[PDB]
Write a protein that holds these residues in place. Structure first.
Motif, short mmCIF file in Angstrom:
data_model
loop_
_atom_site.label_atom_id
_atom_site.label_comp_id
_atom_site.label_asym_id
_atom_site.label_seq_id
_atom_site.Cartn_x
_atom_site.Cartn_y
_atom_site.Cartn_z
N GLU A 114 -69.50 6.86 13.63
CA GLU A 114 -69.38 8.26 13.26
C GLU A 114 -68.46 8.96 14.25
OE1 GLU A 114 -70.06 9.99 10.74
OE2 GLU A 114 -69.49 11.97 11.51
N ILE A 115 -67.37 9.52 13.74
CA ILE A 115 -66.42 10.24 14.57
C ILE A 115 -66.79 11.71 14.55
CG2 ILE A 115 -64.01 11.01 14.79
CD1 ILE A 115 -64.31 8.16 15.63
N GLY A 116 -66.70 12.38 15.70
CA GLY A 116 -66.86 13.81 15.69
C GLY A 116 -65.77 14.51 16.46
N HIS A 141 -60.17 16.21 11.70
CA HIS A 141 -61.12 15.11 11.76
C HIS A 141 -60.59 13.86 11.03
CE1 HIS A 141 -64.58 12.83 10.04
NE2 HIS A 141 -65.10 12.99 11.24
N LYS A 155 -75.11 15.24 15.70
CA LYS A 155 -74.91 13.90 15.14
C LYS A 155 -76.07 12.95 15.36
CE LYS A 155 -70.86 14.63 13.45
NZ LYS A 155 -70.70 14.61 11.97
N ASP A 215 -67.72 7.26 9.28
CA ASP A 215 -66.27 7.40 9.23
C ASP A 215 -65.50 6.09 9.23
OD1 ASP A 215 -66.29 10.21 9.10
OD2 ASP A 215 -66.79 10.27 11.25
#
Ligand SMILES: O=c1[nH]c(-c2ccc(-c3nnn[nH]3)cc2)c(-c2ccc(F)cc2)cc1O
Ligand SMILES: [Mn+2]
Ligand SMILES: [Mn+2]
Ligand SMILES: [Mn+2]
Length: 200
Positions: A124-126, A46, A139, A113
């Protein structure tokens, strides 16, 4: 084949900067990277995606968004993204507070992020070992109210992003997907993948 250790894989396949930042984060939250190893590998993955997401993206002399893959270009270029992930809690929130006060954007309830100076929004990175739509909702439902953009990657090449807005060009996201595919394959050859995949 023989079963390798996830520890060995992490130290061999991620650069030491990533690994160190990951260890520090786990320690900070009270977990041991030598026991929670699948989490360790997940955190490295991640983190790397976060860096690769911002890699090469700048804002030019005229203030538009450009891509440069050298280290030799123009010092008047500003990085397009602020990277929040990888910082300890105090510094992460310090950076978020600075951004929010400068740009006047609303303050997020949880640490995101990235911040995108072009789109003027947090990201927001997932990265998930499950289906992207399911993880996306997880999320979306944690962040509650949203100005924060969500972008989900899977290890099998699927993406999902808020309002079908994917932020980056296809080439940038292809690099990320290729890296994830490579991580998955390498884990698989060491017989680490099945255990890793099921642990999420
Ligand atoms: O989407 C995210 N995600 C995660 C994340 C990463 C791995 C797991 C995991 N893997 N196996 N069990 N838990 C859960 C959340 C983290 C994260 C990073 C550092 C840290 F010290 C703890 C969490 C951060 C994120 O932005
Ligand atoms: Mn974090
Ligand atoms: Mn984060
Ligand atoms: Mn994230």
């Amino acid at each position: 084949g023989p079963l390798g250790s996830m520890e060995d894989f992490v130290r061999q396949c991620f650069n030491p900067m990533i690994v160190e930042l990951a260890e520090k984060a786990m320690k900070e939250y009270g977990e041991d990277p030598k026991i929670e190893t699948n989490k360790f590998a997940a955190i490295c993955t991640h983190l790397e995606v976060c860096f690769m997401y911002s890699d090469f993206h700048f804002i030019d002399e005229r203030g538009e968004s450009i891509i440069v893959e050298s280290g030799d270009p123009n010092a008047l270029l500003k990085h397009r993204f602020e990277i929040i992930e990888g910082r300890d809690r105090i510094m992460a929130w310090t950076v978020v507070n600075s951004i929010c006060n400068t740009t006047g954007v609303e303050k997020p309830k949880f640490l995101p992020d990235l911040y995108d100076y072009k789109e003027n929004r947090f990201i927001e990175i997932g990265v998930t070992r499950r289906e992207v739509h399911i993880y996306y909702l997880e999320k979306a439902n944690k962040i509650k109210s949203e100005k924060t953009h969500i972008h989900i990657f899977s290890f099998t090449g699927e993406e999902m992003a808020t309002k079908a807005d994917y932020t980056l060009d296809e080439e940038s996201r292809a690099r990320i997907k290729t890296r994830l595919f490579t991580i998955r394959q390498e884990m698989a050859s060491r017989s680490l993948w099945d255990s890793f995949r099921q642990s999420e």
